[PDB]
Amino acid sequence: DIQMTQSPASLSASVGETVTITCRASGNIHNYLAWYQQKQGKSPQLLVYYTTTLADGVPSRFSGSGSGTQYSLKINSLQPEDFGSYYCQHFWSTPRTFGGGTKLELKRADAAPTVSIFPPSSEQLTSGGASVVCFLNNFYPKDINVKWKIDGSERQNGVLDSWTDQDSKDSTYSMSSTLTLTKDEYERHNSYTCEATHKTSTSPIVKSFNRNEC
């Protein structure tokens, strides 16, 4: 089997930059190499084939080269659309092999989250559930901190966070935070708080709500 080694595993680059992704084969693959771009849980898309040939409608800024066992893909003048993973694959013998992938993120100016705290809806209350949901949308960079404060007391349980891939348009990230309690545990308190700790500030972006108001 010919093993493919892709490097680096990740890249961060600004619009206009040049990115070099490498792929090494453990045996000569005689120019039988393809490159794919993959956006968040969508089917991989063929970019380049037979080492150097661009697939129809792939822009000229993509450029593959190599021979033997050494191959490369360069993105000259990156565009926001270029985020995602890239994979190389040899087509020389069977088994075919994919390199491990490269996750490319576009850098952009820092931007602070816009937060929204949501009280549990009647429907859940009835079920005996109490999920407090907080959205921190459109922030860059990806690192953000969220403290959950129930009556000033910070919680470190029953909280679920989930991030978004980078946004195709403004290259931004978004996140959700869900604190789930049992209806009674919930009714047993009054100030519910979501406190965002993000690089763009020295003072937490706090959002709170009170159990008996609208």
Binding site: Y32, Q45, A55, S85, S121, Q124, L160, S174
Partner: protein, 218 residues
């Protein structure tokens, strides 16, 4: 026009067998090869095997003993059979058309969850603001899709007519149950005056929930 569509069971218990069909359209299986590729959650692409135009098949060295590939040129079907599954076989499965040493058309893929846990429909709740909120130029609404299994779920706004400012967040697995949420941001001119609905579908359950984001009138 060229289309590859895969179909499989979504959930299987460990130690069982899996059978996935790839139905092709717009081309004939005698002139192209069909490859099978799998993607474990958060991992890279892994080649499973292939069937060439001439019926010859090739398999991944490590799965050679559990795998079988075959087709029906007449029926436009390629079939993958994997014996003795493990949880590690959980991945999104794809069939892709090989046109002269390049995979040019890929199927949408089919998620396969290898577990003993069971189908549970989602519980959909609206996420409405509070009186405080209509003072800003725009409002963010939401949908909680709690305790469902297995993945995936499709969340849509206003039957797909609301695509801008929609953020759907990937599912998180608590205890054999998934929780997902999505937010949509709309101009304060529209909600509440105009209706905003969150259509949530869970295929694995024949669940098709629609929820109207109504103002918390309290």
């Amino acid at each position: 026009q060229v289309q590859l569509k895969e179909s499989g069971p979504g959930l299987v218990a460990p130690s069982q067998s899996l059978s996935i069909t790839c139905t092709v359209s717009g081309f004939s299986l005698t002139g192209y090869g069909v490859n099978w590729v799998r993607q474990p959650p958060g991992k890279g692409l892994e080649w499973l095997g292939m069937i060439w135009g001439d019926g010859n098949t090739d398999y991944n060295s490590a799965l050679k003993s559990r795998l079988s590939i075959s087709k029906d040129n007449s029926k436009s079907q390629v079939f993958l059979k994997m014996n003795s599954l493990h949880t590690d076989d959980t991945a999104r499965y794809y069939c892709a058309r090989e046109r002269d040493y390049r995979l040019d058309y890929w199927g949408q893929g089919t998620t396969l969850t290898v577990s003993s846990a069971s189908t549970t429909p989602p519980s959909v709740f609206p996420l409405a603001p509070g009186s405080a909120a209509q003072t800003n130029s725009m409002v963010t609404l939401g949908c909680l899709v709690k305790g469902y299994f297995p993945e995936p779920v499709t969340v849509t706004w206003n039957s797909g007519s609301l695509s801008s400012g929609v953020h759907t967040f990937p599912a998180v697995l608590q205890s054999d149950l998934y929780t997902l949420s999505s937010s949509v941001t709309v101009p304060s001119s529209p909600r509440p005056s105009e209706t905003v609905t969150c259509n949530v579908a869970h295929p694995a359950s024949s669940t098709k929930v629609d929820k109207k984001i109504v103002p918390r009138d309290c």
